[PDB]
Amino acid sequence: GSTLSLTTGTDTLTGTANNDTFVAGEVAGAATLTVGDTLSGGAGTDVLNWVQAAAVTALPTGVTISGIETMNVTSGAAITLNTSSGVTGLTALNTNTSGAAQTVTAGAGQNLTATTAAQAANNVAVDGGANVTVASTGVTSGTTTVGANSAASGTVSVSVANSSTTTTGAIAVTGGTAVTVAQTAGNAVNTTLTQ
Amino acid sequence: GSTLSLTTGTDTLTGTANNDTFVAGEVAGAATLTVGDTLSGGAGTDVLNWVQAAAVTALPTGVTISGIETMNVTSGAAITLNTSSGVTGLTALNTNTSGAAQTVTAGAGQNLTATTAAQAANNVAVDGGANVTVASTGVTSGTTTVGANSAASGTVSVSVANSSTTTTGAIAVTGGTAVTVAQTAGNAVNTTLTQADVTVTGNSSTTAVTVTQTAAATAGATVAGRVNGAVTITDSAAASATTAGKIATVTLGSFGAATIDSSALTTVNLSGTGTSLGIGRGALTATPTANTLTLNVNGLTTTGAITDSEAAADDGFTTINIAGSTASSTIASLVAADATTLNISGDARVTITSHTAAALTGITVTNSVGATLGAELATGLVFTGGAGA
Ligand SMILES: [Ca+2]
Ligand SMILES: [Ca+2]
Ligand SMILES: [Ca+2]
Ligand SMILES: [Ca+2]
Ligand SMILES: [Ca+2]
Ligand SMILES: [Ca+2]
Ligand SMILES: [Ca+2]
Ligand SMILES: [Ca+2]
Ligand SMILES: [Ca+2]
User: Fold this and answer.
1) Fewer beta carbons within 10 angstroms: which end of chain B, N or C?
2) For Ca(2+) 6, which residues are the binding ones (chain A) (predicted)?
3) Which of B7, B10, B11, B40 to mutate against chain A (most A CBs within 10 Å)?
4) Backbone phi, psi, residue B309, to 5°
5) Distance of CA B79 to the CA centre of its chain
6) Cβ(A152)–Cβ(A176) under 8 Å?
7) What is the largest CA-CA distance in chain B?
8) How many other CB atoms are there within 10 angstroms of residue A58's CB atom?
9) Do A3 and B10 make contact, defined as CB atoms within 8 angstroms?
10) Which residues of B30-69 are buried (b: 16+ CB within 10 A; e: fewer)?
11) Among B102, B72, B86, B84, which Cα is nearest to B35's?
């Protein structure tokens, strides 16, 4: 397929009906998913990569994603987004933090995956979606919390890793066809972590 | 292959599966390795050249380099990077400063090379990697320090040059299959530079250590003055009662107050201008069976004593062999209190100005040019010459 780049402006981008990928990176450290951006996919090998130093805050005004199957969202700070509207045709949403919070809500029909490195005292909270997956490492105080506002259509699969001696903060799930929460503890040889 | 240029944006670059090269320069003095950049190589002739006026700091958010074998990093200021993650497939990391610090950590499987010009008071520190190489010039105050946090899989090879009169700052290595630290001194004709104190501490892979320096000299009208740095070599199992010990050979090329401590030590290679060597063996409680020090000399001259520190209160070497080679050597004092046989062999004169080896039962020169012993032999002690004076 072809590879299409968003700008700091208003973009009107239309895919090839093929293996095409949409890049919503930075320009001078300025975000490229911006007001009025409208994206359109075609055939079913479509990816949107949204990467920003700045915290993801919501979908910006007038933005519509359509016909794009996979959405990857990566931030140098927190993510807060809802994708139950504006977005249509999306089978897979993947959101990625390293060292800040996450607060994500997906539309049913969309498989959410919230990967978080060095979670520390930050809190992950996710809602809705079809199959959800939480993958959290370096955890500490941080709560993990799923379906508190809206359950998943399919399966929940949390997993949480902690290296700290300070104890692993809550995990709560509500709803889903089947639930798995998999904790680990990786603390040092003369310490006690309570899970 | 094909040649691909990074921009001040988010780049998605994919190689030919061939000899392709990736350029990560500057645009308006703005970096081109930036947030979200993803690079992909293919086949095994892949190079990434990252060049920046600004200090290298860390890999930027969302960056993933993959399928790229060689990474070259050059900065107008300091480098700090860790490459044990984010980068995958990387066989070679080369980092380049001129006049600022370096603080680099490579993943095992990656050959690190940290070249630094005009090091001055800046400190190089490197860790991990497979084979590491440090190449530092214009040195002064700067410490050089390897494997303080993580040892190399393969060989360490430091080398350090100084032109200053201010003295060469520490050098420390920890770990590696074999270690070499090569100092030089290039100071002016009426000055004295005193060289760097070296410490090597083996991990349990360290078979050999080499520590070369520039020869000492007295500051003259047309003689560049040099004093030598202390060297301290230590094996892992130096303090252990039971663990083997791995450092077998040590090579010196000039030295100040030198120490070795290894229960696996058999050979010492000496060379140039020395102050003192103190040989200790590991504090193993077991009574040692192989007790042969081979001591190959070549152009060696000593202020003071080669001592067997272990012999005094513990189990030293029973037989010492000295093989003089290609140039005259002079050992001011040889102190070996558990020594029994002494065989001087080889190719060029060995002179021992004074030995202190009370338990000697025989001395046997087999050397071509000859051997000279300035100390009066024990009335009980047999001596046998060979050809040569
Ligand atoms: Ca398409
Ligand atoms: Ca835009
Ligand atoms: Ca599509
Ligand atoms: Ca870029
Ligand atoms: Ca290639
Ligand atoms: Ca490659
Ligand atoms: Ca000892
Ligand atoms: Ca002993
Ligand atoms: Ca003794």
Assistant:
1) C
2) 42-43, 46, 67, 69
3) B10
4) -60, -30
5) 22
6) yes
7) 86
8) 11
9) no
10) ebbbbbbbbbbbbeebbbbbbbbeeebeebbbbbebebbb
11) B86
Amino acid at B55: A
A144 close to A160: Cβ distance less than 8 angstroms: yes
Structural method: cryo-EM
Four-point Cα dihedral B54, B55, B61, B64, nearest 10? 100
Considering only CB atoms, B8 lies closest to which of A23, A27, A49, namely: A27
Query: What SS3 class is residue B313?
Result: helix
Structure tokens at B292: 């042969």
Q: Residue B236 gets which letter from DSSP? A: G
- Amino acid identity, residue A103? T
* Residue whose pair of structure tokens reads 């599966």 in the numeric block: B17
Is B40:B16 a contact under the CB 8 Å cutoff? no
* Reported structure resolution in angstroms: 7.4
Give B352: exposed, middle or buried? Use CB within 10 Å, 0-12, 13-18, 19+: buried
Structure tokens at A70: 């996979």
Distance B67 CA to ligand 6 centre (A): 4
Contact A3 B12 (CB under 8 A): yes
